[PDB]
Amino acid sequence: DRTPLVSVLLEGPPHSGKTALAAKIAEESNFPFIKICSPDKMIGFSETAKCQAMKKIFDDAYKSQLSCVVVDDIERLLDYVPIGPRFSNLVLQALLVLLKKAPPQGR
Amino acid sequence: QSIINPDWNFEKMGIGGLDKEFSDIFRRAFASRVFPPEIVEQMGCKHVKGILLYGPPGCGKTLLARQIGKMLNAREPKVVNGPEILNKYVGESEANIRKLFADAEEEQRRLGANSGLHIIIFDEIDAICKQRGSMAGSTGVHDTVVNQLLSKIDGVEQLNNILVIGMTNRPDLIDEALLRPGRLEVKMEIGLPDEKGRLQILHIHTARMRGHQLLSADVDIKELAVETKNFSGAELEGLVRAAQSTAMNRHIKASTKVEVDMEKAESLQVTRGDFLASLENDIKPAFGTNQEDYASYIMNGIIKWGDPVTRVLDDGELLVQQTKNSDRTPLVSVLLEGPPHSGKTALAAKIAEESNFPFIKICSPDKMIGFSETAKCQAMKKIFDDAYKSQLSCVVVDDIERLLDYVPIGPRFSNLVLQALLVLLKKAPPQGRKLLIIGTTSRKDVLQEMEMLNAFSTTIHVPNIATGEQLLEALELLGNFKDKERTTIAQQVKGKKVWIGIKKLLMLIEMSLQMDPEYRVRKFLALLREEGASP
Amino acid sequence: DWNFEKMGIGGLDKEFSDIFRRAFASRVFPPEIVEQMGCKHVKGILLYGPPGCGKTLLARQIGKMLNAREPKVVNGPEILNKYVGESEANIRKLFADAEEEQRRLGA
Amino acid sequence: IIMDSSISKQALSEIETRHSEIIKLENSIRELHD
């Protein structure tokens, strides 16, 4: 109860099998509510649409007893390209505020 | 006798903490109408024939309607519901609206400059009198009704024995013509009870039970009145009914077939616990408060891990005492700085709580997820505007760098928010008021670059554990490792350097307490040494 | 005659008990104590939630519980009529028998 | 640049005796009864 929020990050070289080890960990927990937020369901969306989708998915998790959420391929959620560099700032700010927002009491 | 009756009453009737408004309205109206006519003719002035009441839902307007209907010695009041005069057949709406004023006009004709007054109460007046702009609808019943009423109230003919009291829940949806001078003047607002009207209301709604001795001696009215804040009369009555309901059901038993415990519920009393439970889980004020924020920002309390923790609180208390008792400086600001994961927001919240200022607020980024900069500026402006309506205030803006959307690649941020925050730190409040602003940040140098550090008045450091003895003291005060484990931990830390913040210490202890007893200390030491880093 | 088992609404126990406590409690106790306490009765209930957790079953069974007249149902927006000032009459035509009995008998 | 609009109609209290049968009332009062 001292720590009602925990986050972890999987890192490694590309083409190494990371998106298939987060799914297994999420599945083996047997939590009641499990959802995966991948960027292949948001093809062509502008910044605001992505922010709203992520916010809705995170709100769906505050109305349960305990849950797990997967954010796979971060580098593609907030568009990134080495030239420039260029990226979206709204998505980065939304993520950086959502990663430190404890849920309602006792969840 | 002119109009009023000898028994003013105003306490048996039921109307509660509305004294200044009633006295003021009796001053403005019902004064020229009660006086020797000769003096009035000597000045030669006419009366006022329009009053408008508005306020938040549940304040007592409708009750005032009936009580005024009883609290006069005139002929009789005619009360008509708002949207009941519209009729299907052509021309009947105007017939209904004009049918109301016949008696007053006839009597004025019979006795000009004499006779009593007729009072018409138009409940839900906003239903029929809408803006005459478009209405985008065939037929002009809505326009015709308003035009006819406007012609009747004021027109070529002059009527001086009629008064209209229009009560509305939202003045925004009212035609412009009526609010203009000459149609409806002296508009009052009925707000929420402050402290004494609240006690009067709770006494009015509880007199009966004490009359029959149904309230246990444990209950105290003053305690409940003080505890409940930002309530409206309807909320108070609902709370009383909820406590009553909690007891009524307490004395009953029904799982299979409804059954009352007669001869077991013959004696019934209401205890303070019933009131507390009802107030906690049954009735919640509509205006809202900041209980969740206060209980959520200080999650694990505040402990004393050394000297530094006391100094910051002492300086905050000094600043508060300064803002209380000075007239040359109506505005004061302070900045809290430190490395990340050091407990700055919690300390700011505690400092704000220690003072008993009537108005306190915390404006944090958590409420503005996905907002563009314009919305952020509007929200901050609204917060400060609302804070500009009291004799004392305290607004806490935490995590400044996350308000401007600062990222160190280029770098890039928002300009409108920066300028608005730079201007709102130097505007003094309206004369005879005070304000105290506290800020929380983690990157002092960046702010120093933008020329914002010189707008603040002072800065206070917030250090973290930097000595083995302090770490041992904090561990002891948390009470997790004891006896031999603490002995070995103290042995490993040879009074050397430990640059770790409090939040990280909590996280490390929790992560270390997950294995078997034999390996806990080793894991804790390994994590402390690896992440230990250097200053 | 009435038993909670016969209505077959298993799954919701705290909600039903709370509703029975807050509303159908002041109409069970002897009729003199309530008078002394000087308390009116609560008139109104609101139910909301996801699509299909049992909100219309509760309404139906509560309606069939009581030993009084049958309920009056208004299926969605069934009170709108073309002629000016007829929807108001339609709505006003619902609280008709209640007013008559209230004015005739009293308590 | 578009806005669809709905309309609401009202009936008329058609009266048989508001003209041409006030004359028929006279034909019933001043003539038939006379």
Ligand SMILES: Nc1ncnc2c1ncn2[C@@H]1O[C@H](COP(=O)(O)OP(=O)(O)OP(=O)(O)O)[C@@H](O)[C@H]1O
């Ligand atoms: N000053 C007061 N004295 C006594 N009771 C009060 C007072 N203020 C509020 N109440 C109680 O709360 C309610 C006040 O609302 P009321 O019945 O007057 O309707 P209203 O506020 O005009 O409603 P609406 O806002 O929809 O027009 C009443 O039930 C009354 O008992």
Ligand SMILES: Nc1ncnc2c1ncn2[C@@H]1O[C@H](COP(=O)(O)OP(=O)(O)OP(=O)(O)O)[C@@H](O)[C@H]1O
């Ligand atoms: N003496 C103390 N002072 C402050 N916090 C303490 C103290 N003792 C225990 N704590 C715990 O440490 C927490 C401090 O971290 P907090 O949640 O306020 O984040 P923070 O320091 O504002 O973080 P960041 O700067 O990264 O946003 C307090 O909420 C409380 O849970």
Ligand SMILES: Nc1ncnc2c1ncn2[C@@H]1O[C@H](COP(=O)(O)OP(=O)(O)O)[C@@H](O)[C@H]1O
């Ligand atoms: N708590 C429940 N117990 C038993 N059946 C239920 C329950 N909730 C829903 N149902 C079933 O759902 C159907 C009715 O649901 P319905 O009242 O239409 O829900 P809603 O109106 O919220 O869509 C029936 O088949 C009923 O048996």
Ligand SMILES: [Mg+2]
């Ligand atoms: Mg991948």
Ligand SMILES: [Mg+2]
């Ligand atoms: Mg009212």
Ligand SMILES: [Mg+2]
């Ligand atoms: Mg902080």
Ligand SMILES: [Mg+2]
């Ligand atoms: Mg339904």
